[PDB]
C-alpha cells in the first residue's frame, strides 16, 4: 500500500532550571502530524476526524491519562535525579516511540531517547540499551529505570501490543487522506553559476503526494548522472517540494529536459524542456 507505514509519538522536555520544565509533544504518521499535545494541561489535540483510528473514546481517554501522568511525572523525576546525574541547567531531553508496518506484514516497534541533542538510549527486546554517546550517565539511567517493573511493563504493552493495533486501525481509518494521489506541477529556472563557464539549471517539482517521486535531468532518454537532488521540503496541506539541479557548461545546456515520474501521473511523465538564449 502507498502512504505512511508508521506511527510515532515524540517528546521534547526542556529543563530551564531546578524549578521550571515544559514538555512539547505530538503524534505522527511518518512526516504527517495527526496529534497535537497541550503542554501545561497535558491534553491531546486530534488534528483529523480519523485521528483516533479504531480506538474507542474510552481507550483514547485512557492513553491520554497515561501520557499526562508520564509527562508530568518525568519532569518530577528528572528534577529529583538531576543532582545525582551531574546535570547542568539548561538541558533538553528528546524521545520518540512508535511502530512500523514492514513488507511481509511484520510490525516492528522502536523507542529512542536523546540528551543534549545526542543519542542517549534505545529500546531493544523490551530492554533499556545505553547509547555510547550517553556514556556513564546512560549506563546509570538504564540501571535505575529497570528497578521499576511498572514503567517497564507499561512501555512493553504500549510498544508491542497497543501501537501495532493502533497503527493498523489508523492507517485504515485515514486511508481517504493517507492514500490519496495529488499531482505535482513542475517548472524550470536558472540558479547561480557553480563555476567558470558553468550554469546551474533547476527543475522544481511541487505539490505531490505521496512522498515517493522521481525527478531527473535528461538528454532525450538518457538520464544525466550529474543530477543533484535537493532535500524534499514540505508544503502546507500534506504535499512536498523538490529541486533537482544540474551543473553544465554554457553551450551544453541546449538539449536538456527535466522528467518527472510520480504515482499520480499514471505513466504520463511531466517533461520540461530547457530552451536556449532566454526562450523560457
Amino acid at each position: 500500500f502507498q502512504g505512511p507505514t508508521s506511527f510515532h509519538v515524540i517528546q521534547t522536555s526542556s529543563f530551564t532550571n531546578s524549578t521550571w520544565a515544559q514538555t512539547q509533544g505530538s503524534g505522527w504518521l511518518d512526516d504527517l502530524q495527526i496529534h497535537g499535545w497541550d503542554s501545561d494541561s497535558g491534553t491531546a489535540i486530534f488534528l483529523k476526524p480519523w485521528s483516533k483510528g479504531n480506538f474507542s473514546d474510552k481507550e483514547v481517554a485512557e492513553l491520554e491519562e497515561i501520557f499526562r501522568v508520564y509527562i508530568f511525572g518525568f519532569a518530577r523525576e528528572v528534577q529529583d535525579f538531576a543532582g545525582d546525574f551531574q546535570m547542568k541547567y539548561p538541558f533538553e531531553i528528546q524521545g520518540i516511540a512508535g511502530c512500523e508496518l514492514h513488507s511481509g506484514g511484520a510490525i516492528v516497534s522502536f523507542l529512542r531517547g536523546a540528551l543534549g541533542g545526542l543519542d542517549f538510549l534505545s529500546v531493544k527486546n523490551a530492554s533499556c540499551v545505553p547509547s555510547p554517546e550517553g556514556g556513564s550517565r546512560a549506563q546509570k539511567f538504564c540501571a535505575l529505570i529497570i528497578q521499576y517493573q511498572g514503567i517497564m511493563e507499561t512501555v512493553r504493552i504500549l510498544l508491542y501490543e497497543t501501537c501495532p493495533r493502533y497503527l493498523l486501525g489508523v492507517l485504515n481509518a485515514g486511508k481517504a487522506d493517507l492514500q490519496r494521489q495529488v499531482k505535482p506541477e513542475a517548472w524550470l529556472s536558472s540558479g547561480p553559476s557553480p563555476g567558470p563557464g558553468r550554469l546551474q539549471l533547476v527543475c522544481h517539482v511541487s505539490g505531490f503526494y505521496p512522498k515517493p517521486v522521481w525527478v531527473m535531468w535528461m538528454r532525450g532518454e538518457q538520464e544525466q548522472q550529474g543530477t543533484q537532488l535537493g532535500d524534499i521540503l514540505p508544503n502546507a496541506n500534506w504535499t512536498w517540494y523538490l529541486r533537482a539541479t544540474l551543473d553544465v557548461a554554457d553551450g551544453e545546456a541546449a538539449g536538456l529536459s527535466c522528467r518527472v515520474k510520480h504515482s499520480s501521473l499514471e505513466g504520463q511523465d511531466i517533461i520540461l524542456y530547457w530552451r536556449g538564449s532566454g526562450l523560457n
Binding site: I10, T12, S14, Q24, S26, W28, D31, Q33, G36, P90, E92, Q94, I96, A114, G116, G117, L118, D119, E185, W187, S189, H204, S206, G207, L233, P234, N235, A236, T239, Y241
Partner: protein
C-alpha cells in the same frame, strides 16, 4: 553543543505577479528547541501565519514549517526572520524567485 538554524524560503507555486500563492519557510538543523519565526512583507510581521508543531530529524535536530498565503508582485519583498539562542540578533532570509 548548540546548532544554529538553517532557513529555506520558497514558494509553493512558480511566482507569477498578481497570482495568489503560498510562501514557505523551512527552519531546520537547530538545537535547542526554543525559537522565534516570523514571515515578513516589506519588513513587517505577517500575522495570518500557520506553522507545524515541533518535530525533529534522525540527528535529533529540530525543524518547523511556517507558511502564509501571498500574492507576489514586482516590488513587494518577502522574508523569513528567525531568532535562536545561537544568534545575537534575528537572522533574516529573503524570498528570491
Amino acid at each position: 553543543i548548540q546548532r544554529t538554524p538553517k532557513i529555506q524560503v520558497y514558494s509553493r507555486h512558480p511566482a507569477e505577479n498578481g497570482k495568489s500563492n503560498f510562501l514557505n519557510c523551512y527552519v531546520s538543523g537547530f538545537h535547542p528547541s526554543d525559537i522565534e519565526v516570523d514571515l515578513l512583507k516589506n519588513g513587517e510581521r505577517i500575522e495570518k501565519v500557520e506553522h507545524s508543531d515541533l518535530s525533529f530529524s534522525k540527528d535529533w535536530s529540530f525543524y518547523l514549517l511556517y507558511y502564509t498565503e501571498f500574492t507576489p508582485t514586482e516590488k513587494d519583498e518577502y522574508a523569513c526572520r528567525v531568532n535562536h539562542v545561537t544568534l545575537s540578533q534575528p537572522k533574516i532570509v529573503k524570498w528570491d524567485r
